[PDB]
Amino acid sequence: SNPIVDYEFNQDQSCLIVSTPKSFDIYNVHPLKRIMSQEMPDAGTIRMLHRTNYIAFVSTKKELLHIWDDVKKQDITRVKLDAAVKDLFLSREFIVVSQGDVISIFKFGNPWNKITEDIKFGGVCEFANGLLVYSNEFNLGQIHVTRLQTDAEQVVGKGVLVKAHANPVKMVRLNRKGDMVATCSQDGTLIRVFQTDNGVLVREFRRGLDRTSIIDMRWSPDGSKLAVVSDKWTLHVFEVFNDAENKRHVLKDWINSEWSICNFKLKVSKGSNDCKIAWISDTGLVIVWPNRRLADTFKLNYNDDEHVWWLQLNQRNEIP
Numbered sequence: 001s002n003p004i005v006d007y008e009f010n011q012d013q014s015c016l017i018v019s020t021p022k023s024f025d026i027y028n029v030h031p032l033k034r035i036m037s038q039e040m041p042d043a044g045t046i047r048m049l050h051r052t053n054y055i056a057f058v059s060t061k062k063e064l065l066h067i068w069d070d071v072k073k074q075d076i077t078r079v080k081l082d083a084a085v086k087d088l089f090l091s092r093e094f095i096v097v098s099q100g101d102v103i104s105i106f107k108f109g110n111p112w113n114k115i116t117e118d119i120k121f122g123g124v125c126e127f128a129n130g131l132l133v134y135s136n137e138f139n140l141g142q143i144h145v146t147r148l149q150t151d152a153e154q155v156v157g158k159g160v161l162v163k164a165h166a167n168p169v170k171m172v173r174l175n176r177k178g179d180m181v182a183t184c185s186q187d188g189t190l191i192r193v194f195q196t197d198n199g200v201l202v203r204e205f206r207r208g209l210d211r212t213s214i215i216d217m218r219w220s221p222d223g224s225k226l227a228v229v230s231d232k233w234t235l236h237v238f239e240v241f242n243d244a245e246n247k248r249h250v251l252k253d254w255i256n257s258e259w260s261i262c263n264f265k266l267k268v269s270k271g272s273n274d275c276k277i278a279w280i281s282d283t284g285l286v287i288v289w290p291n292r293r294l295a296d297t298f299k300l301n302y303n304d305d306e307h308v309w310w311l312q313l314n315q316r317n318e319i320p
Contacts, residue, residue, distance in 0.1 A: 004290040005060070010048040011128065012176075013221070013278045016288060018319075019043040019057060030280040032295055032317050038070070049090045056095065058085045065097065067112070077112040089127035093150050096127040103134060105148070116155060124169050129178035131196055136161070140168030141185060145196050162199035164192060173226075175219040180240070182226055188214040191228060193240055205238045206258050218277040222246070225300075227277050227285060229266075235277075235287070235311065237262035237300065264298065264311040293319040 002020040009016055009029070016027045024046055025037040043066075044058035055068045058081070065079035083100030090096075094115075095106040102118040103125055122135030124143075136142040146159035165185035173182040180202065183192040189211055193203040205226075207214075212230040219226055224246050228236045239261050244251060272291035280286055285298040297315040302308075 004293060005043065006045045007276065007288065007290055008045075008047055009276065009278050010050055012050065013218075013280075015048060015051065016278075017046055017048040017055070018290075019046040024055075024057065027319065029278055029286060029295075030284065030297070032319075034319075036070075045085055045088055047088045047090050049092070052092075054090070056088060056090055058088065067095075079106060079112060086123070087125060091127075091130065093130070094127075094148055096125075096132065098125050101137070103132075122168070124172055126172045126174055126181075128174040129176070131174060131178040133172050133174065133181055133196075135169050135172075139163070141165035143169060143172065143181070143183070145181065145194075145199055160196075160199035162194055164194070170214050171217065173217040173219065175223045176221065177223060180219070180223065182217045182219065182228075184214045184217065186211075186213070188212045188230055191217070191226070191238070193226070203240055203257065205260070207236055207260070208232070215275055216277045218279060220279050220282055222282050224282075227279070228260075229275065229277060229287070231273075233266045233268045235262075235264040235266055235285075235298070236260035237309065237311065239309075261309045262300065262311045264313065266296075295319065 002022060005019045007018040014029060016029050018025055023037055023039045024043050026035045028035050042059055042061035044060040046057035048055055053070045057066050063081045065081055066075050067077045069076045081099055085099045087098035093108055095108050097104045102120050104118050105116045107113050107115050120137045122137045122140045124135035126133045130148055132148055133143055133145050142163045144159055144161055149155045149157045164183045167185040167187050170184040170186050179196050181194045181196055191205045191207055195202050212232045215229045217228045224241045226238045226240055237260055272289045275287050275289045278286045283300045287296045295317045299312040299314050301310050301312060
């Protein structure tokens with residue numbers, strides 16, 4: 001009876017937090033079990049802070065941003081917002097809000113204030129592990145990557161400008177450590193990976209020949225693989241780094257991929273038009289479908305002798 005308003009994973013992929021109109025619930029991703037539920041009216045886009053007791057959500061009733069403490073069951077703070085919220089991120093340090101044409105940054109903890117002038121952008125942004133990445137406001141195929149320095153004069157700060165694509169950037173995904181950015185355009189024809197230190201192109205992958213729009217991308221826990229889903233509705237897995245190159249070994253002849261090592265064609269009802277991807281393990285995956293309130297579990301298999309990979313769908317589970 002309860003539709004899903006918004007849904008997201010906590011930073012490490014261990015939990016799924018969803019808001020319905022009547023409430024918001026937190027589920028354990030795998031195996032899938034409801035950890036808790038809380039009655040809330042009109043909760044909007046909603047986010048989680050790790051496994052901690054703090055939860056952010058945007059009131060669909062008002063312009064408010066609620067910072068909710070689950071221990072004492074109250075709002076520690078409410079934050080006035082000037083526009084609609086496109087995106088939201090939490091760290092034990094900062095609160096990052098994408099509202100309308102701008103990105104606002106707030107201190108996490110008293111006095112919950114705005115610690116830098118709003119950053120104007122082109123609609124696309126991501127914040128993970130102290131690292132901010134956002135579309136440029138004028139050229140939409142260009143991204144800015146910058147560390148947020150909490151202790152410095154001068155929390156801005158510095159920054160690198162990468163021209164990621166010709167067409168405007170569709171989406172952006174940081175890996176866990178934060179040293180790599182997966183990058184996407186409206187074309188969805190090809191995926192790029194940049195080093196966040198210098199913004200240099202690390203790798204380029206080809207998803208397909210035809211243009212499609214890309215729903216989600218997520219990095220494997222160990223940072224070796226990247227999962228991508230298109231609206232053509234096939235799951236792709238790319239190997240960005242094999243074992244040796246990931247562990248930073250010396251490569252005997254380095255001086256001398258481009259395609260997925262895996263596909264799975266997903267069967268999608270006419271209804272569900274968006275989803276999100278999580279890595280259960282180095283070899284596991286889960287796709288979450290809001291419309292169906294459904295979670296599909298995928299197994300990534302490797303044939304040792306032929307050095308080939310294949311995807312398997314193990315399970316499907318309603319939320320509820």
